[PDB]
Amino acid sequence: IANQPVVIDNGSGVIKAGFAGDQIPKYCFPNYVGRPKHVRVMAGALEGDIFIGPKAEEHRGLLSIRYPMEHGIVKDWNDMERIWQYVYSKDQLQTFSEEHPVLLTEAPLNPRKNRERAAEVFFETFNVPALFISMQAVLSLYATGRTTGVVLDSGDGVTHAVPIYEGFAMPHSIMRIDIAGRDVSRFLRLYLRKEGYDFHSSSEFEIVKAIKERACYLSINPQKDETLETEKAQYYLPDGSTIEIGPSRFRAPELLFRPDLIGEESEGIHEVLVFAIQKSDMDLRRTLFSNIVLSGGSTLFKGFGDRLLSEVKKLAPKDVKIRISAPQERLYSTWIGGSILASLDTFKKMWVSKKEYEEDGARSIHRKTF
Amino acid sequence: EKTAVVIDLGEAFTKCGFAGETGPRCIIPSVIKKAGMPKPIKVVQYNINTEELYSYLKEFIHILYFRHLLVNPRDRRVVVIESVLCPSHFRETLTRVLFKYFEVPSVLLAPSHLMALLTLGINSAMVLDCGYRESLVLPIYEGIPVLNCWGALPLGGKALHKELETQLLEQCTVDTGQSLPSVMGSIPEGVLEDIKVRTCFVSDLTRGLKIQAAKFNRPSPPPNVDYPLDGEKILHVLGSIRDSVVEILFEQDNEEKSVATLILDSLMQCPIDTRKQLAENLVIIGGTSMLPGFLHRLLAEIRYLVEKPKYKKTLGTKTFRIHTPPAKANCVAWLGGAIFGALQDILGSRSVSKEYYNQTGRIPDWCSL
Amino acid sequence: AALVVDNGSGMCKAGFAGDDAPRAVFPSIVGRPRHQGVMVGMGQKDSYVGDEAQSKRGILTLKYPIEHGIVTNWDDMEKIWHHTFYNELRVAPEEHPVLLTEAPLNPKANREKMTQIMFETFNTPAMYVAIQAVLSLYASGRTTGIVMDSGDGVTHTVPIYEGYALPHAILRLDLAGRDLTDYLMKILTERGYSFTTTAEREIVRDIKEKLCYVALDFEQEMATAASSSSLEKSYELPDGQVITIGNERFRCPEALFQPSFLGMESCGIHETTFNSIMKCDVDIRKDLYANTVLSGGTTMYPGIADRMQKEITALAPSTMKIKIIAPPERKYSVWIGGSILASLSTFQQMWISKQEYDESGPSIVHRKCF
Ligand SMILES: Nc1ncnc2c1ncn2[C@@H]1O[C@H](COP(=O)(O)OP(=O)(O)OP(=O)(O)O)[C@@H](O)[C@H]1O
Ligand SMILES: Nc1ncnc2c1ncn2[C@@H]1O[C@H](COP(=O)(O)OP(=O)(O)O)[C@@H](O)[C@H]1O
Ligand SMILES: Nc1ncnc2c1ncn2[C@@H]1O[C@H](COP(=O)(O)OP(=O)(O)O)[C@@H](O)[C@H]1O
């Protein structure tokens, strides 16, 4: 439709949205499916479970929250539908799918089935007449203005390091890791359990995620500071309970680069990036070292970029000038680029109309997708 | 040669005996009967002064070897049957009592499921420990205890005791000296535990459905015997009461949180090999599991939960053959410690040397260095 | 009498001189667990050789020193060899001379490293290394022929005209079935069959050997297979998962016919072989048309000879008749070719003894190559 397109700052752990012309996604909130902690068979319980925002931010020791998109894999389709309806409501969208164009953003390693199922809901339940599915790295590049670059993202579990020069669709250059702060905080609370602090409920763990986003960092001398005797600064919960953190405040996030004791011997995206470097060529590599972009929310850490700088410095050889662009709104960079893409006229032709979806569907998705 | 000191531990108890000892020499709880103090002060304490604990350790360990051993352990090693999640600093306080205070030769820390694997003499295993206050599932990949796949939840008998006191608030027909609903303030949970030992029978799965009917829209309260306490305190408890406390172990409405949920999902993170492996490589430990009519009703519900929508596809058709403990499931862990300390003197190298703790003052745990 | 040791790029094969069945039929793959905070499981190995790694494949990190045949850490394969002796034949390498395999365009340092392991380490009385394609044509019983050799790690067509050196047309090509398996698990990931480790790769390479065949008209067969829902055959895996493969079976080997799928900047296998053909005398290439020696165990495919044949036939003149030489035992004909090759009179003199090596150093590898 010829209206203001819905610019969505999508995501497995944090999904926000706004519109074109807006400089910020008008309603910032994360990805979560908030169900009660009790049997809602008896009347007078937390039924409906459509608890997004203040409803979820209301009941704490009463909500067992769920998460649909797990590393780009969404299974709580109907829960996504009610979250959509929450957005479609006058608290977030104030309009309808038919009333406004919608823009969908994605990342690699996304099976076609997720795209098809989501498009089914978006063109059948909701009916966007002007809907397009896209990436997120493109939008981050739009925000940075660059087109040439080793774009990285640090989502909740979304981590793709694909070197993309001048917007070149290079699928063989795909280097996507599907893990981030999510499981990091999960075993960080396992450390808390190692020192007697159980957080089994979702909200009980959501507070831990608030610590992850609040009191967690990257000690650039991980084994040195680990060997150094910690001091364990005390954290204070919404309950105000005194909780020391210390080594664990940087252990589990430094463990991303050094997955030594995980079992899932991951890489720490710098290794994956070196693999992507190998995929590229020295003439382009030399340029792309300076062309490195970061995104997502897990990038937010004290000593984050500098630790990874030290990592690649230990990795890259001499006379290798590397530059890693990373603003402060890596999350919004996607949304900013979504507004930029919304401002594109080619994008108008890039989107699939509702009728076009009715004509082909999945084939139209994966053919007109790019 | 020498019989290493095999010491069982845990939230509730602390047992011990020689290396290869076949038999419960004694059973000590995880508390210390403090002199002057009318109640036995516990040891399972967190975010607490490790110095008063150090005193408890010195005295308690001293008289402890005098209880189970009646002789100084400075000649042989000490098998320390630990388990993960305990404060490693507290564990080092234990270590300093050992080396820095009693000067024991050398010790070694090992989890319970490891000794369970020693008992079965197998390599891969999907074992759950029915701890006192908690639940503890631990998968093994051919002798390798799986890290990312596990089970650990505050799902033990302590919460059930809280539920029992709630029932005491509800069901209380304590005669005069004739109802007296919880007129008496505190309850001795240890006495309540032995009451459960002599009373808590466990029903059927269909009776579990009867308990579900008792929740909304009552069947078969017998077998049920009243309880007379000394001092004219006699009260009756239905069998449906204790069975309700057993059945509430699987409340998954809107939260999907239970025992089988933990087990199933722990297997969900396992790979293809480990799936069928742990299906056949299956055992269950913990004392709390030893309930009359609970393991088979339990197992039946486990097999029932295999029919949960996300599990027929994924797991589904897998033979869940379970190993059995040759003795009491609780003592079987201590028995596995006895198994290790019995014929493995060669593994003193793996045992934490006193020398290292002397020249170090610490022990780096499973972290760097 | 001697030691006919084959070094398969995937699995392995071995035996004495003149042995008929390969004894060391085991995976020539290296594996180690996640050496972490846990203790040993009743005492066990560190490295896991083949079947041992294949056994406990859920944790043992399936690796390779082999880089399309290029062994990086020779320690791995040499310990594997020691155990291979003391596994299959339990014979020391010092009493029987050894026979090894090789592929053209191999850095000589590899073979010299190998050589010094056999002498300095294994103390073999004599030794020899030759190309697998020679054993293939040896098993055929010819001397004139284009031996299209195809290992599951590499590929190299070998044009020969009466056992003569024609290396200008002989071209190594790092074409592995593992590469196809890479792309295969990738396309499976978008098919909902999202799997990551190498254990998954082992299962699906066996599935590749199960149902992945070679069609005849890839696009037409692709459209019909898209319509042939029954062709999308299923198989309930060792785990509770089942599969669905109709296109995938032949969709995956088209990467060999089309480097475009991987962006190999090469030519398809059929015309690649034809390019190697184009580097010769066309009138002796006539014999090579008749000498269509399809070899290498990675050619055991359904509908592959007619495919390849038809392709090059379209490239060839009408009079230039393709005459396929491809026994299904070509996989074993490598090791069996070496096994019966050991029984050659001249070969019992053609050797590299202890003092012959020591007194010549690694330089003797050059003239003692073939
Ligand atoms: N039935 C089958 N269907 C499809 N492919 C098969 C089948 N049987 C064998 N293969 C192919 O054979 C390959 C392994 O054979 P091959 O002899 O090339 O192993 P190798 O380790 O490379 O031996 P070498 O290095 O000595 O050549 C596999 O990659 C597989 O693709
Ligand atoms: N300060 C922080 N420290 C660690 N992780 C963070 C921080 N801020 C955000 N994150 C993580 O990044 C995620 C947000 O990034 P985003 O790209 O929106 O993730 P997704 O795309 O998975 O929703 C959050 O879900 C959280 O896991
Ligand atoms: N025969 C039994 N029946 C029921 N519960 C038991 C039995 N034996 C022990 N238990 C309980 O099971 C738990 C296991 O004992 P223990 O090893 O001391 O547990 P933990 O390691 O949590 O302390 C204890 O709470 C104990 O009270």
PDB file of C-alpha atoms in Angstrom, chain C residues 23-165:
ATOM      1  CA  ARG C  23      42.999 -55.714   6.101  1.00  0.00           C
ATOM      2  CA  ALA C  24      43.002 -52.192   7.565  1.00  0.00           C
ATOM      3  CA  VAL C  25      39.590 -51.243   6.278  1.00  0.00           C
ATOM      4  CA  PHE C  26      38.980 -48.485   8.793  1.00  0.00           C
ATOM      5  CA  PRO C  27      38.436 -44.726   8.659  1.00  0.00           C
ATOM      6  CA  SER C  28      41.650 -42.853   7.892  1.00  0.00           C
ATOM      7  CA  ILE C  29      40.333 -40.015  10.098  1.00  0.00           C
ATOM      8  CA  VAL C  30      41.709 -38.638  13.361  1.00  0.00           C
ATOM      9  CA  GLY C  31      39.650 -37.951  16.448  1.00  0.00           C
ATOM     10  CA  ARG C  32      40.006 -36.777  20.028  1.00  0.00           C
ATOM     11  CA  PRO C  33      37.419 -35.977  22.691  1.00  0.00           C
ATOM     12  CA  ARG C  34      36.777 -32.709  24.448  1.00  0.00           C
ATOM     13  CA  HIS C  35      39.669 -32.968  26.888  1.00  0.00           C
ATOM     14  CA  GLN C  36      38.046 -30.988  29.692  1.00  0.00           C
ATOM     15  CA  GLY C  37      37.534 -30.748  33.481  1.00  0.00           C
ATOM     16  CA  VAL C  38      36.042 -34.224  33.697  1.00  0.00           C
ATOM     17  CA  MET C  39      38.247 -37.195  34.435  1.00  0.00           C
ATOM     18  CA  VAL C  40      38.986 -40.277  32.331  1.00  0.00           C
ATOM     19  CA  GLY C  41      36.356 -42.904  31.692  1.00  0.00           C
ATOM     20  CA  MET C  42      37.943 -45.948  33.379  1.00  0.00           C
ATOM     21  CA  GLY C  43      41.186 -45.218  31.522  1.00  0.00           C
ATOM     22  CA  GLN C  44      41.075 -44.787  27.749  1.00  0.00           C
ATOM     23  CA  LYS C  45      42.937 -43.444  24.752  1.00  0.00           C
ATOM     24  CA  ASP C  46      43.679 -39.841  23.926  1.00  0.00           C
ATOM     25  CA  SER C  47      43.508 -40.038  20.146  1.00  0.00           C
ATOM     26  CA  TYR C  48      40.874 -42.209  18.525  1.00  0.00           C
ATOM     27  CA  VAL C  49      41.901 -44.043  15.376  1.00  0.00           C
ATOM     28  CA  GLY C  50      39.169 -44.717  12.805  1.00  0.00           C
ATOM     29  CA  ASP C  51      36.624 -47.185  14.064  1.00  0.00           C
ATOM     30  CA  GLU C  52      37.356 -46.040  17.609  1.00  0.00           C
ATOM     31  CA  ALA C  53      36.532 -42.516  16.586  1.00  0.00           C
ATOM     32  CA  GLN C  54      33.646 -43.879  14.526  1.00  0.00           C
ATOM     33  CA  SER C  55      32.365 -45.687  17.602  1.00  0.00           C
ATOM     34  CA  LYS C  56      32.130 -42.776  20.037  1.00  0.00           C
ATOM     35  CA  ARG C  57      31.559 -40.268  17.250  1.00  0.00           C
ATOM     36  CA  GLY C  58      29.347 -38.000  19.387  1.00  0.00           C
ATOM     37  CA  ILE C  59      32.299 -36.344  21.126  1.00  0.00           C
ATOM     38  CA  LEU C  60      35.512 -37.352  19.362  1.00  0.00           C
ATOM     39  CA  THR C  61      36.515 -34.390  17.200  1.00  0.00           C
ATOM     40  CA  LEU C  62      36.729 -36.012  13.765  1.00  0.00           C
ATOM     41  CA  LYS C  63      39.656 -34.290  12.145  1.00  0.00           C
ATOM     42  CA  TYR C  64      42.165 -34.936   9.463  1.00  0.00           C
ATOM     43  CA  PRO C  65      45.798 -34.051   9.030  1.00  0.00           C
ATOM     44  CA  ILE C  66      44.780 -34.804   5.453  1.00  0.00           C
ATOM     45  CA  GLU C  67      44.010 -31.706   3.418  1.00  0.00           C
ATOM     46  CA  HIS C  68      42.550 -33.401   0.331  1.00  0.00           C
ATOM     47  CA  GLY C  69      45.344 -35.863   0.906  1.00  0.00           C
ATOM     48  CA  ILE C  70      47.821 -33.301   2.206  1.00  0.00           C
ATOM     49  CA  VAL C  71      48.650 -34.542   5.695  1.00  0.00           C
ATOM     50  CA  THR C  72      49.490 -31.649   7.978  1.00  0.00           C
ATOM     51  CA  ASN C  73      50.365 -33.436  11.209  1.00  0.00           C
ATOM     52  CA  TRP C  74      52.219 -36.556  10.217  1.00  0.00           C
ATOM     53  CA  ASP C  75      52.312 -37.688  13.849  1.00  0.00           C
ATOM     54  CA  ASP C  76      48.634 -38.569  13.629  1.00  0.00           C
ATOM     55  CA  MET C  77      48.781 -40.876  10.668  1.00  0.00           C
ATOM     56  CA  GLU C  78      52.085 -42.370  11.748  1.00  0.00           C
ATOM     57  CA  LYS C  79      50.672 -43.401  15.132  1.00  0.00           C
ATOM     58  CA  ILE C  80      47.687 -44.674  13.217  1.00  0.00           C
ATOM     59  CA  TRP C  81      50.115 -46.684  11.104  1.00  0.00           C
ATOM     60  CA  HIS C  82      51.862 -48.125  14.151  1.00  0.00           C
ATOM     61  CA  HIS C  83      48.551 -49.122  15.623  1.00  0.00           C
ATOM     62  CA  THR C  84      47.462 -50.246  12.159  1.00  0.00           C
ATOM     63  CA  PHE C  85      50.273 -52.780  12.185  1.00  0.00           C
ATOM     64  CA  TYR C  86      49.565 -53.844  15.752  1.00  0.00           C
ATOM     65  CA  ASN C  87      45.899 -53.774  14.900  1.00  0.00           C
ATOM     66  CA  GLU C  88      45.698 -55.794  11.713  1.00  0.00           C
ATOM     67  CA  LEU C  89      48.854 -57.759  11.090  1.00  0.00           C
ATOM     68  CA  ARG C  90      50.821 -57.081  14.322  1.00  0.00           C
ATOM     69  CA  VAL C  91      54.009 -57.111  12.270  1.00  0.00           C
ATOM     70  CA  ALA C  92      56.880 -54.725  12.617  1.00  0.00           C
ATOM     71  CA  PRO C  93      57.657 -52.544   9.593  1.00  0.00           C
ATOM     72  CA  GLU C  94      61.342 -53.424   9.769  1.00  0.00           C
ATOM     73  CA  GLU C  95      60.968 -56.931   8.381  1.00  0.00           C
ATOM     74  CA  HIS C  96      58.834 -56.205   5.391  1.00  0.00           C
ATOM     75  CA  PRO C  97      59.286 -53.394   2.867  1.00  0.00           C
ATOM     76  CA  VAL C  98      56.425 -50.986   2.561  1.00  0.00           C
ATOM     77  CA  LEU C  99      54.339 -49.822  -0.357  1.00  0.00           C
ATOM     78  CA  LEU C 100      52.465 -46.528  -0.223  1.00  0.00           C
ATOM     79  CA  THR C 101      50.084 -44.393  -2.246  1.00  0.00           C
ATOM     80  CA  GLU C 102      50.344 -40.907  -3.693  1.00  0.00           C
ATOM     81  CA  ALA C 103      48.627 -38.396  -5.961  1.00  0.00           C
ATOM     82  CA  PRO C 104      50.312 -36.085  -8.523  1.00  0.00           C
ATOM     83  CA  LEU C 105      51.079 -32.381  -7.936  1.00  0.00           C
ATOM     84  CA  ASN C 106      51.931 -33.229  -4.319  1.00  0.00           C
ATOM     85  CA  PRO C 107      54.683 -31.184  -2.672  1.00  0.00           C
ATOM     86  CA  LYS C 108      57.746 -33.371  -2.459  1.00  0.00           C
ATOM     87  CA  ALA C 109      58.259 -32.353   1.173  1.00  0.00           C
ATOM     88  CA  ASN C 110      55.161 -34.383   2.054  1.00  0.00           C
ATOM     89  CA  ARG C 111      56.547 -37.563   0.577  1.00  0.00           C
ATOM     90  CA  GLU C 112      59.988 -36.837   1.983  1.00  0.00           C
ATOM     91  CA  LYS C 113      58.470 -36.295   5.416  1.00  0.00           C
ATOM     92  CA  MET C 114      56.683 -39.585   4.918  1.00  0.00           C
ATOM     93  CA  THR C 115      59.911 -41.232   3.802  1.00  0.00           C
ATOM     94  CA  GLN C 116      61.901 -40.094   6.800  1.00  0.00           C
ATOM     95  CA  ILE C 117      59.109 -41.367   9.019  1.00  0.00           C
ATOM     96  CA  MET C 118      59.425 -44.807   7.443  1.00  0.00           C
ATOM     97  CA  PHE C 119      63.158 -44.860   7.830  1.00  0.00           C
ATOM     98  CA  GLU C 120      63.956 -42.814  10.911  1.00  0.00           C
ATOM     99  CA  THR C 121      60.767 -43.917  12.634  1.00  0.00           C
ATOM    100  CA  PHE C 122      59.566 -47.171  11.134  1.00  0.00           C
ATOM    101  CA  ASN C 123      63.014 -48.468  10.014  1.00  0.00           C
ATOM    102  CA  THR C 124      61.493 -50.235   7.009  1.00  0.00           C
ATOM    103  CA  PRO C 125      63.980 -52.512   5.182  1.00  0.00           C
ATOM    104  CA  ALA C 126      62.909 -51.025   1.852  1.00  0.00           C
ATOM    105  CA  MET C 127      60.058 -48.799   0.764  1.00  0.00           C
ATOM    106  CA  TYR C 128      58.122 -47.467  -2.183  1.00  0.00           C
ATOM    107  CA  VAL C 129      55.279 -45.020  -2.939  1.00  0.00           C
ATOM    108  CA  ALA C 130      53.301 -44.860  -6.200  1.00  0.00           C
ATOM    109  CA  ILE C 131      50.171 -43.318  -7.701  1.00  0.00           C
ATOM    110  CA  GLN C 132      46.851 -45.046  -7.026  1.00  0.00           C
ATOM    111  CA  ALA C 133      45.858 -44.676 -10.694  1.00  0.00           C
ATOM    112  CA  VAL C 134      48.764 -46.917 -11.660  1.00  0.00           C
ATOM    113  CA  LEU C 135      47.318 -49.648  -9.482  1.00  0.00           C
ATOM    114  CA  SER C 136      43.939 -49.043 -11.023  1.00  0.00           C
ATOM    115  CA  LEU C 137      45.257 -49.525 -14.557  1.00  0.00           C
ATOM    116  CA  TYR C 138      47.337 -52.381 -13.185  1.00  0.00           C
ATOM    117  CA  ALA C 139      44.150 -54.043 -12.012  1.00  0.00           C
ATOM    118  CA  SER C 140      42.650 -53.340 -15.424  1.00  0.00           C
ATOM    119  CA  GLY C 141      45.660 -54.927 -17.047  1.00  0.00           C
ATOM    120  CA  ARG C 142      46.625 -52.060 -19.337  1.00  0.00           C
ATOM    121  CA  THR C 143      49.449 -49.620 -19.975  1.00  0.00           C
ATOM    122  CA  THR C 144      47.731 -47.260 -22.449  1.00  0.00           C
ATOM    123  CA  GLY C 145      44.861 -45.354 -20.967  1.00  0.00           C
ATOM    124  CA  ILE C 146      43.350 -42.253 -19.421  1.00  0.00           C
ATOM    125  CA  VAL C 147      43.013 -43.373 -15.831  1.00  0.00           C
ATOM    126  CA  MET C 148      40.482 -40.945 -14.440  1.00  0.00           C
ATOM    127  CA  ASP C 149      41.478 -41.414 -10.822  1.00  0.00           C
ATOM    128  CA  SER C 150      38.986 -40.122  -8.248  1.00  0.00           C
ATOM    129  CA  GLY C 151      39.644 -40.444  -4.532  1.00  0.00           C
ATOM    130  CA  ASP C 152      37.189 -39.120  -2.003  1.00  0.00           C
ATOM    131  CA  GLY C 153      39.650 -36.361  -1.178  1.00  0.00           C
ATOM    132  CA  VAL C 154      41.138 -35.639  -4.598  1.00  0.00           C
ATOM    133  CA  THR C 155      40.689 -36.363  -8.302  1.00  0.00           C
ATOM    134  CA  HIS C 156      43.271 -36.670 -11.075  1.00  0.00           C
ATOM    135  CA  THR C 157      42.725 -38.020 -14.576  1.00  0.00           C
ATOM    136  CA  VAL C 158      45.789 -39.949 -15.658  1.00  0.00           C
ATOM    137  CA  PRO C 159      46.313 -40.242 -19.435  1.00  0.00           C
ATOM    138  CA  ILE C 160      48.795 -43.000 -20.224  1.00  0.00           C
ATOM    139  CA  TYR C 161      49.989 -44.477 -23.520  1.00  0.00           C
ATOM    140  CA  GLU C 162      51.962 -47.683 -22.853  1.00  0.00           C
ATOM    141  CA  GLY C 163      52.974 -46.898 -19.247  1.00  0.00           C
ATOM    142  CA  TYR C 164      54.569 -43.570 -20.149  1.00  0.00           C
ATOM    143  CA  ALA C 165      54.878 -40.315 -18.238  1.00  0.00           C
TER     144      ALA C 165
END
